[PDB]
Amino acid sequence: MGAQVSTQKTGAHETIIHYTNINYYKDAASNSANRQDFTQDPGKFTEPVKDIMIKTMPALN
Amino acid sequence: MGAQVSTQKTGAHETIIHYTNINYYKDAASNSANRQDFTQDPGKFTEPVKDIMIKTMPALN
Amino acid sequence: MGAQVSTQKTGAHETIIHYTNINYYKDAASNSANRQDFTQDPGKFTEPVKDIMIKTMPALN
Amino acid sequence: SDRVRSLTLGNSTITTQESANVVVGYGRWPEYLRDDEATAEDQPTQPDVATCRFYTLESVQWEKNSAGWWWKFPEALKDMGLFGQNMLYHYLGRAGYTIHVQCNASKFHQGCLLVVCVPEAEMGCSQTDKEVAAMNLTKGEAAHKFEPTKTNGEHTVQSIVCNAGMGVGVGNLTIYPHQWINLRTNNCATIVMPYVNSVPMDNMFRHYNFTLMVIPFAPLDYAAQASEYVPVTVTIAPMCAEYNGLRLAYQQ
Amino acid sequence: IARVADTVASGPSNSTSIPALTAVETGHTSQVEPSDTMQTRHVKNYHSRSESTVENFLSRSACVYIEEYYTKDQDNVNRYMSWTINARRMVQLRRKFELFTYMRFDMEITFVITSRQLPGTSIAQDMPPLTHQIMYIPPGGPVPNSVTDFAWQTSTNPSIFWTEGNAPPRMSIPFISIGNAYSNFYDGWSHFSQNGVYGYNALNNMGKLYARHVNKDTPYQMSSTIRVYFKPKHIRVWVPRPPRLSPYIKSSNVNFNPTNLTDERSSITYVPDTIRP
Amino acid sequence: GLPVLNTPGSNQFMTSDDFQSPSAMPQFDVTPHMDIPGEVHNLMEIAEVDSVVPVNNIKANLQSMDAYHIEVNTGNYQGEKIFAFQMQPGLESVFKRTLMGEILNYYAHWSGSIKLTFTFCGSAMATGKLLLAYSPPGADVPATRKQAMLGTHMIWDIGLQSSCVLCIPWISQTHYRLVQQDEYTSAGNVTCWYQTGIVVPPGTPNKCVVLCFASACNDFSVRMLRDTPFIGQTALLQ
Amino acid sequence: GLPVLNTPGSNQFMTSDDFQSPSAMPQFDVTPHMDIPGEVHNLMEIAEVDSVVPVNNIKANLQSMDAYHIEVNTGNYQGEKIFAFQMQPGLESVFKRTLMGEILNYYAHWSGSIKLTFTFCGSAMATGKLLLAYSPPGADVPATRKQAMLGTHMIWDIGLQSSCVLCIPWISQTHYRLVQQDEYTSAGNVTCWYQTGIVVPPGTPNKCVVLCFASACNDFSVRMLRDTPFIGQTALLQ
Amino acid sequence: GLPVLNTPGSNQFMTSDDFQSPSAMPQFDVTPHMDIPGEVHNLMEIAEVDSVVPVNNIKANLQSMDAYHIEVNTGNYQGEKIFAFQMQPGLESVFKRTLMGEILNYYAHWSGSIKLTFTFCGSAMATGKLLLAYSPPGADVPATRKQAMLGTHMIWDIGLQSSCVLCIPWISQTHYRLVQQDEYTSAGNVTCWYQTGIVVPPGTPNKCVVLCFASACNDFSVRMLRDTPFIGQTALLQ
Ligand SMILES: CCCCCCCCCCCC(=O)O
């Protein structure tokens, strides 16, 4: 089938950890949640300044 | 098996979106609806004229 | 598995029409009916004569 | 000039100097039944030019208070030359038809008709509690007319125009093969109807394949001394006429 | 795939091109678009007519019938159901099907059977799960005259046995029509003499459907209501037509009462003032 | 386990389903297959076999061989209809019980041509010509030979070849017809007349029997499985 | 067997599901497909067909052809509004019942442009120029020709070409609008005025009929399947 | 069919499951995606944004801007503690409601460092040095500057650079801590003192406001999803 093997979340016996998935429905809205999308970009809220500010330097000068 | 992978309808997280299907019954009447047949030809009802009419021109002349 | 793809019976949208099958039981008596065996030989009952009779000819002569 | 057009079928020919193109059914043109779609095993008969020709029906008068008219085919052509003779002697029939509605006036008259071909135009009864009679559905080449008001007849058809005698809106009849006859631009209307039915062939007396309706949306009007007589003539010619099941003529 | 047309960017104009001018007399529907009668900007339209498909439109279970049958043989209550299959007794689905003259498709039939115990002063029971039997009888087959008729043997007629509590029974059927397509409208008769039956009933004959309780009897009177649902699939439709305007009166013909073309209003120039600061 | 979702129609029991199921007798050694004569594969093999038709099914003969007898006499009988009946392979009382019709009653739809074989059982000295006509639906039943002659007919000349076949072509509007034929799915009628007459020598019977046989052609077929209305009961047999 | 775990929604019955199911009639031979004229694939093929619009839908004409009549007269009528209405393809009483609007009522969302075709049915001698304007939501309905002229308008000149199209562009904030349009999803209004006037020769009518047609463009589309509020009942029909 | 065995937990409904399910609206055309500014991917993006901390949360200021005011005065104030509080990002009333703490209340576990930014809002002429100390759990809260000075401290010198950051390092025994911190998962305290004092010129205020900001670092993270105890109701709203 259109099987798609992904990686499972670390277990309590770490340091065959993968699962299989197949969509049965025609609408993408039927698929399960995307609990594995780990994107980040705090810059939008933490550093929305026009002029890049270097940590080790004075904010104003 | 006789699996057949198709494309799913766009989801609310666009811009692995495919599903698998296998028929289990011997009669085609048992299969699911054909919700993905997008054919069109309005000409039958909107332009059933014998002489092609060019938009940018006079209907009669 | 020992999957076996066959052809489905014509649907109400003709003129992917195939299904898959796998036997799970050890006895052939467990399998589904053979609704697709189309053999014929009316000769046994309609023409059980010893001497071939040609339609366009006299039965007796 | 696409205004002028000529039609030739059999020993008949129609002329026009003020037409508005030609509507061809649902994009299809009349054609004989193919072998991979036939059911009747007997070899059909095809009179051709004998039945496929222009048949003119009784003219009708368009008046300032006219509400409309309607004909049912192939029934309406039961007494038309050899086309009607084949209907009697055969069990099955199949034809195309080229509807040509004529109606001329003058640059001083005004009005607008709606020539439409309604497949399976099943109609309702005046008295919703009773049924309709064939005699009230179609009466030969004699046209039935729509009324601007409700009808009361026992087994009569609800002739009230606004519902076209079908329980629908007249303004939506444009979804069927049609043309208009806007006197200020037109002079006639032609529609080539292909055989439309859920069966390869069918009886021509028992079944009314389609209904031709001529409903005016713009009332006929004019000034004094202007010709008050404005007739509307309907001409139709069968196409690719096939017949099956030959037997003793049917007694009407 | 089933995407909609995009709008080409248009600018000023001044030529002999007359896309706005035409003549409806030809029976031709104008193929004009905004860019032809004004200055437009380019727009990548991603909209899709995927849900306008005749398949997606008609492929949805809709109730087509409903009858009630009792368990005990008291009074003149019917202990079994009978029904001359057709979809002309439920205005909703009937109106959709009638948007087209001819139809061709397979169909998914689902049954929603529910039971109850009729009111009473002393009705303490303990009845086991009720099992029902739905039997389809194609035109000509023997019809049962009782809840114990031999016809319920279902020797060759398709039948379903369902027990309450479980998911509503379902099963698909092909294209039964003896014609090349189902007919929603038949402007003809059943007899060559142009009389007898007129319209739908003149040719359509999908047979009958019977139901009953397979349980012998209940201490106190109980009744069940079966609801039949139709869901056409693998659809094909021909010759579109004006939607039903007048309310449906009979389920055997198209009789109707002169209905208004639409709702009324003050005048042709009436437009409600919705801006009042 | 594997996340599953039960669909409607679960746990139900449809008499016409077709699933697999555990065998109550595991590893049972089926009795060796034996090649037996006359095996049937399709029921149509039976409906294609000629069977005597009880054309003379009048109340007085419903239980005698006279039901199959179709008398023909010597002498002037012009304008006289030897016999007639509708074309309802499964509904017409005449065909209703023949091998052919008997099978059609297990189905609701039928299509194809039919072979009506007529056999002259008179003496070897009797001669004659009969007109076997078939008129498709649409008009009244042929009242005269002329009317019948206008339809699909067969002029049978009695001679050494005893039998004569009148193949009724499938001339229908729709592809199929209901076994429980109504006026809509009418098939027509079949009328027999005297083309000439039955001449006979001295010292020879004047009345002769003509048997009728009916069977399906290679273009015949049934379609809607249903129960036959020719068998029932009021209680379990014992 | 295979360890399975049933997920919520099992054994339920959703009218809009789409699963496979056993056929009650195994190996049924479907009737041969026949190529019938005028096949529909998408309902939009219908909504794109012009249909007469009952602009003059006043109580007195709700059952007469006058409902479609849009009169125009000769003589000074400057400052007079020939007609007007809101842009609610499925809610506005004027469009509510047209082929277009009739279909939109089976859906809750709509988008795209609309083609309002106007046809002059006067005599061939009558002349004139009308101003067909369309004003997007935001301000009051044009009370004068100047106000209407500020919006998207079309100056129609009556002549040999009887019809004239006023394409109402899709100028909305959101991609879609509700068929059950509210103030938020307002579409605007359409008002018609006299650009000049209708001049006519002697011995010719002074009042003329102007029919209105409405249909969707190639950029139109519906989206939310729902039941139409134009049909109901109080009990099973018989 | 395929022999199956239902495992425990079937037909149940767990609010935190994640299975597939049939769409009630087949082939629905979702509205085109539009790139909108300020998209959030992880809630931590919010907890990393500085938010004013109500250090002066005394009953009399629970509804005034004084709740955020941290006064500092000129003159001898040696040995005086400017302010102090526990290190409970989600439990401490001081942080409990900040953007950071507000998010932690949707989780039961937390880990990482915290950035306490202090901004001097006095006049441009006012000068001074403050001692921002942080003492890990284990001993009593610093009663004197000497005791506080023994712990992780930051000597802030007021000048052109208005703000000064006191990063509280994650010095815990366990990898994570409970938002509902108890004595076991204690984090310590934060006390502010006068390193020197606030000297000011003539004609200049003697009292100044010092705002406090709190946010998470790049090493912060929450873990146990739970419901926030800062919102509830007694009946359906209307
Ligand atoms: C096993 C149950 C069989 C039910 C047959 C239903 C056929 C429905 C046909 C509908 C015809 C029409 O709507 O024009």
mmCIF file of N, CA, C and O and ligand atoms in Angstrom, chain E residues 83 85-87 97 103 105 107 109 111 136 158 171 173 176 182-184 200 204 206 209 230, chain G residues 24-25, ligand 1:
data_model
loop_
_atom_site.group_PDB
_atom_site.id
_atom_site.type_symbol
_atom_site.label_atom_id
_atom_site.label_comp_id
_atom_site.label_asym_id
_atom_site.label_seq_id
_atom_site.Cartn_x
_atom_site.Cartn_y
_atom_site.Cartn_z
ATOM 1 N N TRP E 83 -43.745 -2.099 0.831
ATOM 2 C CA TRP E 83 -43.407 -0.851 0.165
ATOM 3 C C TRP E 83 -43.013 -1.020 -1.294
ATOM 4 O O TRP E 83 -42.111 -1.791 -1.619
ATOM 5 N N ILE E 85 -41.073 0.230 -3.729
ATOM 6 C CA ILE E 85 -39.878 1.046 -3.892
ATOM 7 C C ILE E 85 -39.933 2.151 -4.945
ATOM 8 O O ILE E 85 -40.317 1.924 -6.092
ATOM 9 N N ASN E 86 -39.535 3.348 -4.521
ATOM 10 C CA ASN E 86 -39.480 4.541 -5.363
ATOM 11 C C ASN E 86 -39.055 5.705 -4.471
ATOM 12 O O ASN E 86 -39.186 5.632 -3.248
ATOM 13 N N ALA E 87 -38.543 6.772 -5.075
ATOM 14 C CA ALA E 87 -38.101 7.932 -4.308
ATOM 15 C C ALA E 87 -38.948 9.164 -4.607
ATOM 16 O O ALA E 87 -38.418 10.256 -4.814
ATOM 17 N N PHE E 97 -33.150 14.570 -7.583
ATOM 18 C CA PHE E 97 -33.198 13.635 -8.698
ATOM 19 C C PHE E 97 -33.892 14.258 -9.901
ATOM 20 O O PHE E 97 -33.492 14.031 -11.045
ATOM 21 N N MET E 103 -31.117 9.245 -15.247
ATOM 22 C CA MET E 103 -30.049 8.954 -14.302
ATOM 23 C C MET E 103 -29.557 7.520 -14.417
ATOM 24 O O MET E 103 -30.312 6.621 -14.776
ATOM 25 N N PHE E 105 -26.795 4.924 -12.149
ATOM 26 C CA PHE E 105 -25.876 4.784 -11.031
ATOM 27 C C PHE E 105 -26.159 3.561 -10.173
ATOM 28 O O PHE E 105 -27.233 2.959 -10.251
ATOM 29 N N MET E 107 -26.196 2.017 -6.154
ATOM 30 C CA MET E 107 -26.729 2.664 -4.967
ATOM 31 C C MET E 107 -26.467 1.939 -3.658
ATOM 32 O O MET E 107 -26.495 0.711 -3.589
ATOM 33 N N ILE E 109 -27.812 1.339 0.005
ATOM 34 C CA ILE E 109 -29.033 1.428 0.795
ATOM 35 C C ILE E 109 -28.790 1.114 2.265
ATOM 36 O O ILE E 109 -28.293 0.041 2.610
ATOM 37 N N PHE E 111 -30.490 1.114 6.294
ATOM 38 C CA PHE E 111 -31.742 1.042 7.039
ATOM 39 C C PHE E 111 -31.567 1.426 8.502
ATOM 40 O O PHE E 111 -30.683 0.912 9.187
ATOM 41 N N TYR E 136 -36.284 -8.073 -0.037
ATOM 42 C CA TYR E 136 -36.573 -7.393 -1.289
ATOM 43 C C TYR E 136 -37.253 -8.371 -2.238
ATOM 44 O O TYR E 136 -36.772 -9.486 -2.442
ATOM 45 N N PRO E 158 -33.130 -11.420 -2.171
ATOM 46 C CA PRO E 158 -32.151 -10.898 -1.212
ATOM 47 C C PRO E 158 -32.846 -10.461 0.076
ATOM 48 O O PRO E 158 -33.894 -9.816 0.036
ATOM 49 N N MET E 171 -26.215 -2.271 2.325
ATOM 50 C CA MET E 171 -25.868 -3.127 1.199
ATOM 51 C C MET E 171 -26.035 -2.375 -0.115
ATOM 52 O O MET E 171 -26.957 -1.573 -0.269
ATOM 53 N N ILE E 173 -26.449 -2.017 -4.393
ATOM 54 C CA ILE E 173 -27.178 -2.613 -5.503
ATOM 55 C C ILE E 173 -26.717 -1.923 -6.781
ATOM 56 O O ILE E 173 -26.440 -0.723 -6.782
ATOM 57 N N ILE E 176 -30.275 -1.416 -11.729
ATOM 58 C CA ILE E 176 -31.392 -2.308 -12.034
ATOM 59 C C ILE E 176 -32.197 -2.010 -13.300
ATOM 60 O O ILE E 176 -32.558 -2.932 -14.034
ATOM 61 N N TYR E 182 -32.194 5.301 -15.644
ATOM 62 C CA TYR E 182 -33.419 5.512 -14.881
ATOM 63 C C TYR E 182 -34.094 6.748 -15.462
ATOM 64 O O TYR E 182 -33.421 7.679 -15.903
ATOM 65 N N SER E 183 -35.420 6.758 -15.459
ATOM 66 C CA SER E 183 -36.158 7.893 -15.993
ATOM 67 C C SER E 183 -36.940 8.586 -14.880
ATOM 68 O O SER E 183 -37.768 7.964 -14.215
ATOM 69 N N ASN E 184 -36.664 9.869 -14.669
ATOM 70 C CA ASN E 184 -37.359 10.636 -13.639
ATOM 71 C C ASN E 184 -38.654 11.204 -14.200
ATOM 72 O O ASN E 184 -39.593 11.488 -13.457
ATOM 73 N N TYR E 200 -44.106 8.574 -14.509
ATOM 74 C CA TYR E 200 -43.204 7.674 -13.794
ATOM 75 C C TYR E 200 -43.739 6.256 -13.609
ATOM 76 O O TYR E 200 -43.189 5.300 -14.157
ATOM 77 N N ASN E 204 -41.498 2.725 -14.433
ATOM 78 C CA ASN E 204 -40.636 2.346 -13.317
ATOM 79 C C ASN E 204 -41.278 1.248 -12.480
ATOM 80 O O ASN E 204 -42.465 1.308 -12.160
ATOM 81 N N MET E 206 -39.322 -1.018 -9.546
ATOM 82 C CA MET E 206 -38.172 -1.562 -8.834
ATOM 83 C C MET E 206 -38.555 -2.685 -7.876
ATOM 84 O O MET E 206 -37.712 -3.184 -7.130
ATOM 85 N N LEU E 209 -40.474 -3.994 -1.074
ATOM 86 C CA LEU E 209 -39.610 -4.294 0.058
ATOM 87 C C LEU E 209 -40.470 -4.563 1.289
ATOM 88 O O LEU E 209 -41.335 -3.760 1.634
ATOM 89 N N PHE E 230 -31.304 6.191 0.677
ATOM 90 C CA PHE E 230 -30.683 5.955 -0.619
ATOM 91 C C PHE E 230 -29.474 6.862 -0.790
ATOM 92 O O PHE E 230 -29.505 8.034 -0.413
ATOM 93 N N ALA G 24 -26.167 -6.778 -2.799
ATOM 94 C CA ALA G 24 -27.285 -7.676 -2.540
ATOM 95 C C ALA G 24 -27.628 -8.485 -3.785
ATOM 96 O O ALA G 24 -28.366 -9.467 -3.716
ATOM 97 N N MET G 25 -27.084 -8.068 -4.922
ATOM 98 C CA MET G 25 -27.331 -8.744 -6.188
ATOM 99 C C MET G 25 -26.017 -9.078 -6.888
ATOM 100 O O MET G 25 -25.594 -8.379 -7.808
HETATM 101 C C1 LIG I 1 -32.523 -4.499 -2.594
HETATM 102 C C2 LIG I 1 -33.321 -3.198 -2.630
HETATM 103 C C3 LIG I 1 -33.555 -2.782 -4.083
HETATM 104 C C4 LIG I 1 -34.079 -1.348 -4.118
HETATM 105 C C5 LIG I 1 -34.091 -0.836 -5.558
HETATM 106 C C6 LIG I 1 -34.097 0.692 -5.537
HETATM 107 C C7 LIG I 1 -33.971 1.233 -6.957
HETATM 108 C C8 LIG I 1 -34.077 2.757 -6.929
HETATM 109 C C9 LIG I 1 -34.296 3.270 -8.350
HETATM 110 C C10 LIG I 1 -34.656 4.754 -8.318
HETATM 111 C C11 LIG I 1 -35.242 5.148 -9.683
HETATM 112 C C12 LIG I 1 -35.382 6.654 -9.825
HETATM 113 O O1 LIG I 1 -35.155 7.397 -8.888
HETATM 114 O O2 LIG I 1 -35.789 7.170 -11.001
#
